[PDB]
Symmetry: C5
């Protein structure tokens, strides 16, 4: 197999509308926000514009191929793949996807999708101008799939919070923490999982 | 049947352009707005920006399947389904759909579509900065289907409302209407959602 | 025939790119603007934002079906139908179509398309804050079809649908049909001019 | 042939991606801007918003049909035709096309496309508020086709006839100049038309 | 072959989704920014709006044809070609592509794609109002392809930095420099190449 064959096979057989659930267990989705910039903060209205990479991983065994004597990974347009229906609950604009919409697929079916996104959020901006800073909480989960179909978890790994954060922003990041939740909305009987990412930041002098 | 089969069958045979009317009785559509946020209020111009979940339910039996030994529900792209042609009459921007455009379909054909929407409205903003607050009325109905084809009916007020909004919700009420426009002989149904809100102190 | 059959037949056989001219006669298009709101008026720049229903009717016999023991009307996506190439000459933004893009088709081929549109216009805003108000003239006609292919006519209570919450009020709406020759081309092109007389309220 | 047949044949056989070059000669494109309005002028930033009809003509013989006992002209969606890849070099927004995207095609293959366009430009706004006015130069040419593939020429005419009487501005004069430019990126010459719009604020 | 045949063949056999890697060697991509205009500078927020031609070249042999007695080049919609997944890392708006989206393809498979783009960036705007000006660094590389699949290099050319820059801008260009980098991100084990274009400019 070469890349052309792999991509052809994926395109011809991939079912972008079918959740790759296996043996009726939930698809385990990992989500991690890598903050790149903070723009347009407004303490009066409690709104903020953020740019972040939304690192998203999951497994879809239907994409798998035998990689002996073949490429181990390819880049695939997300239009040809099933993608988790994640949404930020407190976003007040739709995601502006800044980057090419390609996911990376490994021969065992592991998928990585990591777009850079600019989005405006409603959250707690109070104290952005103090030492202790503001703490903006971003809530992300599957819009339509309950806990038996999609589980959402923060990425297990440690990292430099500001690793990719712009040195030219008027703001700086003090801390990022994550919390997993499972919520029952009065609309539906099942539980829906989400990750809450708490961004602690302040204005630089 | 597995999910793949169900979704394949729906895709291959769904008529997104065909209203699932049965025996010429109207498709009964339920509409309910779950308010998430109020931004950008303007008492001078009587305009307001709102974020809300537009909970929409209806039945389409052409989607039904035998669910013994099969999944009972699936998520389906709305591009593969007929969806009611609802519009907010007093909206002054087109709906900005914030969420993935998927509906939930049950094996008996019951459909739920609940996108989060940001939209600007023309309505009564007067009194927003007072104790009794403003009351903004949002009118939603089928744009082109009369009452014999589509009926619209209303389904805690702040359950999902952002605690970080500059505004707070005092009350939400709903009223069903049936209106005859001078352009057309038939009646058209709508739901009027009255949002009573004020600026927080 | 049920609705599914009718819609299937229309989709399979409709030619959205073909003007439904019959026997060399122009397609008779009716146009009427139902004003819903007036927002963002600017007397300095002579620009105004308007929301209106653009009621558009015409006949396309190719859509017709025998309706005894069948539905008499269906809603059809405009992407499946020929639609008149109308434009507002003095619009300075492209139409923002607010509503689902569906037309109503009757079994004899009569079509109604009535989207709610928000659009900005260049026009005479002077006097908007006076008793007699401003008179904004909106000119609408076929962009590319001359008078032998498309005729345009005004439709044989002005505030009926106008928002009571607008900062403005409508004093009067009048309509005039015109036939104009542009230097770019030898044939005449029809338009309807809708004159909206409005003023700022107390 | 009726219109349905003509439009069907055009749709089925049109190669929107193929430049209708005939016999090693460049496709001759005519361009003319009919100014409708001038909005949002900014003398500090040298930027201006203009609305204009971009009258564009060329010949594509692959579209031709025998018109004896047939319509002589049809309106065709530009998605079904090859269209010149014109761009305004000094535009700072993408064209906002205001009108239905249809071209007029004559039975001999002559094409006319004339959309109304709103676009923002970077140009010389100085003096806009004086008697002699400002002169904004708009440069339009094929983005990717050199002079052996596309030639561009201005269409003696009043490019001002359609200008809004309700604009805050007025047009004093419009002139055109044809250029042939070599860019350091590429060895060939690329043609453009420069339209100079002389205008001022009304007093 | 005429142009119609060439374009037909390209459309029918082109795999826009397949990186034209040849024999386990990265696709060599050249990138060069031709600055056209600088608008909307903000020294408080360190943001700037720039208009530039993003000159991008690479080779795709699957596009090649025998050009004896045939046209040597054609213009091709990029929707029919593989195109490098380049992104500007410090962009804060998506690229507004101003020009027709066509690439130029030579009979040997060389491709040139050069759209004019308007985009807003986060970068160092300080000193823009001084003699020495500001230096805004723009970082461009493949979003998803590591160094064994795509290499990125500045264009070998020497150039006049202001050749196409608008005389009507409120700003002027003092200097443009380029640096190639190879970076390892903590998300992945491989290295990703980028070009950093440093734009030294000031208010007139
Ligand atoms: C039956 C659940 O289907 C749903 C749920 C939701 N929401 C409630 C569950 C959590 N996600 C927010 C919206 C939206 N659309 C459809 Br469709
Ligand atoms: C026959 C009615 O068809 C209609 C009606 C309407 N409206 C009048 C009925 C209620 N909805 C507002 C628009 C718009 N487009 C078409 Br098409
Ligand atoms: C046959 C004329 O073809 C035309 C005419 C116009 N206009 C002149 C005729 C009246 N309508 C305004 C635009 C625009 N595009 C094409 Br294509
Ligand atoms: C054959 C060169 O191909 C080009 C040239 C240019 N430009 C230089 C030639 C004149 N047009 C401006 C852009 C842009 N894209 C491609 Br692709
Ligand atoms: C193999 C890694 O897959 C990736 C990596 C990245 N990035 C990390 C490498 C450098 N480019 C920035 C994003 C984005 N999407 C996918 Br998919
Ligand atoms: C190209 O085709 C021409 C025939 O016109 C011939 O001269 C030559 O052999 C061909 N070149 C290759 C490498 O096939």
């Amino acid at each position: 197999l070469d890349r052309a064959d792999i991509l052809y096979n994926i395109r011809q057989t991939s079912r972008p509308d079918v959740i790759p659930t296996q043996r009726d267990r939930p698809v385990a989705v990992s989500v991690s926000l890598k903050f790149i910039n903070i723009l347009e903060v407004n303490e009066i209205t409690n709104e903020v514009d953020v740019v972040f990479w939304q690192q998203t991983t999951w497994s879809d065994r239907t994409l798998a191929w035998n990689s002996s004597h073949s490429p181990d990974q390819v880049s695939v347009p997300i239009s040809s793949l099933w993608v988790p229906d994640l949404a930020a609950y407190n976003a007040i604009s739709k995601p502006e996807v800044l980057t090419p919409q390609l996911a990376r697929v490994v021969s065992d079916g592991e998928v990585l999708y990591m777009p850079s996104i600019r989005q405006r959020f409603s959250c707690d901006v109070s104290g952005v101008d103090t030492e202790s800073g503001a703490t903006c909480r971003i809530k992300i989960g599957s819009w339509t799939h309950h806990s038996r179909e999609i589980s959402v978890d923060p990425t297990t790994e440690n990292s430099d919070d500001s690793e990719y954060f712009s040195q030219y922003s008027r703001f700086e990041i003090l801390d990022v923490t994550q919390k997993k939740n499972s919520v029952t909305y009065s609309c539906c009987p099942e539980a829906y999982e989400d990750v809450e990412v708490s961004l602690n930041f302040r204005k630089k002098g």
